[PDB]
Specification:
This is part of a larger assembly, with one copy of chain A (111 residues), three copies of chain B, three copies of chain C and one copy of chain F (64 residues). Chain A is built from no helices and eight strands. Chain A folds into two domains: 44 residues, N-terminal domain of TfIIb (Single Sheet), CATH 2.20.25; 67 residues, N-terminal domain of TfIIb. In chain A, the strands form two sheets. Chain A has a four-stranded antiparallel beta sheet, with no helix packed on it. In chain A, strands 1-2-3 form a three-stranded antiparallel beta sheet, with no helix packed on it. With 111 residues, chain A is mostly beta strands. Chain C is α+β, with helices and mostly antiparallel strands. Helices cover 21% and strands 16% of the residues of chain C. The longest helix of chain C is centred in the N-terminal third of the chain and has 9 residues. Helix content of chain F is 19%, strand content 33%. Chain F starts with a strand and ends with a helix. The chains are: A mainly beta (111), B mainly alpha (49), C alpha+beta (129), F alpha+beta (64). Chains in contact: A-B, A-C, A-D, A-G, A-H, B-C, B-H, C-E, C-H, F-G. Chains B and C meet through loops of B and loops of C. Strand 4 of chain A pairs antiparallel with strand 1 of chain D, so a sheet runs across the interface. Bound molecules: zinc ion (3 copies). One zinc ion (ZN) binds next to loops of chain F. Chain A: One of its GO terms (cellular component) is RNA polymerase II, core complex.
Chain lengths: 111, 49, 129, 85, 42, 64, 147, 49
């Protein structure tokens, strides 16, 4: 989540306030500035797992092309779900399956 | 046989099916006769030759 | 999509129109383009609101009227298309449907004839729709 | 498909443990290969840290720019490749 | 009702070729060109 | 490094064509048009994306 | 719409587009501004529909900064008019009005060609960039040309 | 006999799918999981025929 400016709306850039010795978020088209809630400024994940759980929707159970399983839902204990392996398109992606209960829509595995 | 169709080899199978019949194993002999699914897969391999 | 689908199956929308719901990508695409290659299929009843479910919509009564040429108060191929028993699908819509290979595969069965061919087991999904 | 065929000296070639030692010395390992994540903090006090996670680590250890570069190594790949901090 | 047999499937297919034949994609395409497409191009 | 480029633009004053030279100094964001004939000089600011057609356009508007 | 930058090579990994009858590729942000939506915060609101994911935002970071100095509609349209390099001496008073035709017509003409409907092209442009990054983020396979 | 050997080969392919999806499959040197998975299934089916 990146933050811009509520007036100018330009993407605010992080800049240090040397005199008070605190981190600010400054604009570049006007004089607006505000205090930083997070010392972290940037993160780079080399060994990443983001996106695998990204593809979750409410109508996946209406797709008749998906295979159906008997797995017990932890929430409602229904005997009717669709399942699918990971939608992550990496070459090293695992083949472990995700099951989606058609009632509460929770995602679990067989581990 | 590759997943030409989104996550399946033919529209007569469900998605994410890696079983023998799904990815081109022709169980029958030429004497017995091939099923329609097997037939197309055999024609794909034959075309490549 | 159910409403739109029913308009094509009655004739209100031209039968060659494609109605494609891609659920995963959250996209709904409709094509009235010229030049799409399509083929006809039997419609199977999929709505769990009737005893009809799991069977072919087409019955011997339609087959009876086809051989006569007239209804019992011209009746040919296109009469079937605008009465909801056959529809056209193109390559894009074909991606989202589940097709049985023969009418006999719509219902589970009760062999060991060493001459005849083996039918596939189909045991990866417990119940097909 | 460029490929080398690397025969080993006889005394080493009949002892699988010594051959594994040769294996790890030849194989190229970069820092990128073992790094799981990198981070950039604003840590203005050089003797402390806003990060509660590295509190007990840096406080006991200690007993310039305010920007901090914090990189995390993956334990599994570091253990397999036999590399120490 | 009853089940659709193999012979019944060929009755349906017979109705298709009775109405459309084998070259209707050639003829209908050209017919649409004379009726409408020429006019629109003008 | 500076870029010294010849162009096929017509000088707005002496009217000699193919005699305007453009010197683009990106280190200081300063572009320079020069004639080779009457040698009139015109300076204008340039970015990193600019090309001889960008400052020659600014020269047409600076006259009118 | 081409995504430059190779794996750990190409430095700034920005995105430029190609327009009919214009010489060299123009960065995406510039054409967004040139259509009447200059506000950055609005630009990102047209492309990415998930503010939560950093990755679908870190890759658009260099595109903002390489098109930051173009801060309004008029200087945006002007730059496009200079890219074409047709009839040297078009001027700003009119070189804008020539580029407004290259944006209204030709560029995505299947959506519409009447005036005062630039909201559809801006929304569509954001969709394209979204699809481009999904493939670059390995969240979707590249399309199969033989489908 | 012929039908049995093909039936038992389809079962072993099921076991391989189970193992690979429950993280119980041995990784072959130089190969990712999906390569190793695809490799083992191919070897089984050609030996079955
Ligand atoms: Zn501002
Ligand atoms: Zn549930
Ligand atoms: Zn001059």
């Amino acid at each position: 989540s990146f933050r811009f400016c509520l007036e100018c709306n330009n993407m605010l850039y992080p800049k240090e306030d040397k005199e008070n010795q605190r981190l600010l978020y400054s604009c570049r088209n006007c004089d607006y500035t505000e205090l930083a809630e997070d010392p972290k400024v940037y993160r780079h994940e080399l060994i990443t797992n983001i996106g695998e759980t990204a593809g979750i929707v409410d109508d996946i159970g209406q797709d008749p092309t998906l295979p159906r399983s008997d797995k017990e839902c932890p929430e409602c204990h229904s005997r009717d779900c669709v399942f699918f392996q990971s939608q992550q398109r990496r070459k090293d992606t695992n083949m472990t399956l995700f099951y989606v209960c058609l009632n509460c829509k929770k995602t679990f595995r067989d581990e | 046989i590759a997943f030409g169709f989104a996550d399946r080899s033919l529209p007569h199978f469900t998605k994410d099916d890696f079983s023998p019949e799904s990815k081109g194993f022709v169980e029958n002999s030429y004497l017995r006769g091939l099923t329609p699914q097997e037939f197309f897969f055999h024609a794909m391999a034959g075309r490549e030759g | 999509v159910s409403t739109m689908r029913d308009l094509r199956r009655s004739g209100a929308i031209s039968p060659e129109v494609s109605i494609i719901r891609d659920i995963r990508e959250r996209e709904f695409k409709i094509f009235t383009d010229v030049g799409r290659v399509y083929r006809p299929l039997f419609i199977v009843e999929d709505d769990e609101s009737k005893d009809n479910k799991g069977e072919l919509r087409i019955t011997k009564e339609h087959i009876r009227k086809i051989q006569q040429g007239y209804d019992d108060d011209v009746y040919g191929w296109s009469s079937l298309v605008t009465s909801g028993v056959i529809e056209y699908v193109d390559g894009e819509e074909e991606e989202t449907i589940m097709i049985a290979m023969t009418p006999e595969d719509l219902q589970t069965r009760s062999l060991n004839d060493t001459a005849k061919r083996i039918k596939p087991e189909m045991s990866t999904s417990s119940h097909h729709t | 498909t460029p490929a080398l065929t690397v025969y080993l000296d006889r005394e080493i070639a009949l002892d699988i443990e010594k051959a594994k030692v040769i294996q790890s010395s030849i194989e190229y390992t970069t820092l990128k290969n073992v790094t799981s994540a990198t981070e950039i903090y604003y840590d203005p006090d050089p003797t402390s840290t806003v990060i509660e996670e590295d509190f007990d680590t840096v406080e006991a250890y200690f007993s310039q720019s305010p920007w901090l570069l914090r990189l995390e190594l993956d334990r599994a790949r570091m253990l397999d490749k036999q590399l120490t901090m | 009702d009853d089940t659709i047999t193999t012979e019944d499937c060929w009755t349906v297919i017979s109705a298709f070729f009775e109405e459309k034949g084998l070259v209707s994609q050639q003829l209908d395409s050209f017919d649409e060109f004379m009726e409408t497409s020429i006019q629109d191009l003008v | 490094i500076k870029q010294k480029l010849e162009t096929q633009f017509t000088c707005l004053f002496c009217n000699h064509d193919n005699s305007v030279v453009c010197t683009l100094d990106k280190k200081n964001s300063i572009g320079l048009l020069e004639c080779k004939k009457c040698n009139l000089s015109f300076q204008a600011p340039i970015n990193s994306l600019s090309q001889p057609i960008d400052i020659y356009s600014d020269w047409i508007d600076a006259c009118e | 719409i081409k995504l430059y930058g190779r794996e750990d090579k190409g430095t700034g990994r920005t995105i430029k587009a190609t327009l009919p009858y214009v010489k060299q590729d123009i960065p995406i942000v510039i054409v967004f501004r040139a259509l009447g939506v200059v506000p950055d915060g609005e630009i990102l609101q047209h492309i990415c529909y998930d503010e939560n994911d950093w990755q679908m935002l870190e890759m658009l970071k260099p595109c903002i900064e390489e098109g930051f100095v173009i801060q309004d509609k008029e200087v945006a349209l002007d730059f496009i008019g200079r890219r074409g390099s047709a009839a040297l001496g078009i001027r700003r008073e009119k070189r804008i009005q020539y580029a407004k035709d290259i944006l209204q017509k030709e560029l995505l003409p299947h959506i519409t060609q009447e005036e005062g409907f630039e909201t559809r092209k801006t929304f569509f442009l954001g969709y394209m960039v979204n699809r481009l990054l999904l493939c670059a983020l390995e969240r979707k396979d590249q399309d199969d040309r033989d489908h | 006999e012929i039908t049995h050997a093909i039936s038992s080969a389809k079962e072993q392919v099921q076991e391989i799918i189970y193992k690979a999806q429950h993280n119980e499959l041995e990784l072959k040197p130089g190969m990712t999981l999906r390569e190793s998975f695809e490799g083992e299934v191919s070897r089984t089916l050609n030996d079955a025929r």
